[PDB]
A paper describes a structure:
The broad substrate specificity and cellular functions of PP2A are controlled by formation of diverse heterotrimeric holoenzymes; each contains a common core enzyme formed by the scaffold (A) and catalytic (C or PP2Ac) subunits and a third variable regulatory subunit from four major families (B/B55/PR55, B’/B56/PR61, B”/PR72, and B”’/Striatin). TIPRL (target of rapamycin (TOR) signaling pathway regulator) is an important PP2A inhibitory protein and forms a complex with PP2Ac together with α431, excluding both scaffold and regulatory subunits. We determined the crystal structures of mouse TIPRL and its complex with the PP2A core enzyme at 2.7 and 3.8 Å, respectively. Structure-guided studies reveal that TIPRL inhibits PP2A by perturbing the phosphatase active site, and together with α4, exhibits a robust activity in disassembly of active PP2A holoenzymes in a highly sensitive methylation-responsive manner.
TIPRL possesses a unique butterfly-shaped protein fold with two extended layers of β-sheets that pack closely and in parallel at the center. Several helical wings (HWs) arch outward to give an overall butterfly-shaped structure. TIPRL structure is very similar between mouse and human 35 and is likely conserved across species due to a high level of sequence similarity.
Author numbering: 11 to 78, 107 to 139, 145 to 257
C-alpha cells in the first residue's frame, strides 16, 4: 500500500505483532529487558525523494530513544529516521512554527507499538500522514496514560509545502498529573486529540529540514 506525488514517494506497511520468542531476541539486540506487549517491528511509514533523501518511522528505531532499572513506560522522543546516501536532509533550527490553520487526497495511519502497562494504563506510538495537492502533513504521536496518576503526550509534527525547499519538524511534549486536571470527563483520558489541548507544554523544539542541492 504505497502512493507517489511528483517528486515524492510514500511507502507504508501495516503488519501484525512479532513472534513471542522473536522479541526476546530483539530485546537482546537493543539491550534492555522487555519490549512492549504489541510490537509492530515490521510496520514502517517512509517518505523519500527521487534523490534518495527522506525520512522513515519504525518502532525499532523509536525504542532506541527510551532511556537506559529502565523505562517500563517506553517514553520516547524519537522524531524520525533520515534516509538517503551522500544527499541527506540537514537539520537547522528555526523560528517557523506549524500553526495548523486543505483538502485531503491521501491518508493512512500506521501503528508502531502498544503496551497496556500490566493493566495499569496505556503506552502507544503511532503516525498519521495526510497528503494534499500542495503539501503534506504528518504526525508521530507517543501517548502515555497511567490510570489515575498521569498522562504524557510527545507529538512530532512534520510539514512540507510544494515550492518550499525545506520541511518543518515541530516537537512538543505535554504532561500532566491526573489529579491536577479539575473537571475533565474520564472519556477524555481516552480521546488523545481532545485532551492534548488541556495539558501543559513541557518542551517545544522547532527545526527546519533544508534540502540538498543537486
Amino acid at each position: 500500500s504505497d502512493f507517489s506525488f511528483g517528486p515524492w514517494k510514500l511507502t507504508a506497511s501495516k503488519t501484525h505483532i512479532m513472534k513471542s520468542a522473536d522479541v526476546e531476541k530483539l530485546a537482546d539486540e537493543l539491550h534492555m529487558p522487555s519490549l512492549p506487549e504489541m510490537m509492530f517491528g515490521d510496520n514502517v511509514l517512509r517518505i523519500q525523494h527521487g534523490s534518495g533523501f527522506g525520512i522513515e518511522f519504525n518502532a525499532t528505531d523509536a525504542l532506541r530513544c527510551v532511556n537506559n532499572p529502565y523505562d517500563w513506560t517506553y517514553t520516547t522522543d524519537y522524531k524520525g529516521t533520515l534516509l538517503g546516501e551522500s544527499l541527506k536532509l540537514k537539520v537547522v533550527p528555526t523560528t517557523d512554527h506549524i500553526d495548523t490553520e486543505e483538502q485531503i487526497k491521501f491518508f493512512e495511519e500506521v501503528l508502531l507499538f502498544e503496551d497496556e502497562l500490566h493493566d495499569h494504563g496505556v503506552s502507544s506510538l503511532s503516525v498519521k500522514i495526510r497528503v494534499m495537492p500542495s503539501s503534506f502533513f504528518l504526525l508521530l504521536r507517543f501517548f502515555l496514560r497511567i490510570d489515575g496518576v498521569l498522562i504524557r503526550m510527545n507529538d512530532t509534527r512534520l510539514y512540507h509545502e510544494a515550492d518550499k525547499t525545506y520541511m518543518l519538524r515541530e516537537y512538543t511534549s505535554r504532561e500532566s498529573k491526573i489529579a491536577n486536571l479539575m473537571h475533565v470527563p474520564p472519556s477524555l483520558f481516552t480521546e488523545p486529540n481532545e485532551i492534548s489541548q488541556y495539558l501543559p507544554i513541557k518542551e517545544a523544539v522547532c527545526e527546519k529540514l533544508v534540502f540538498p542541492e543537486r
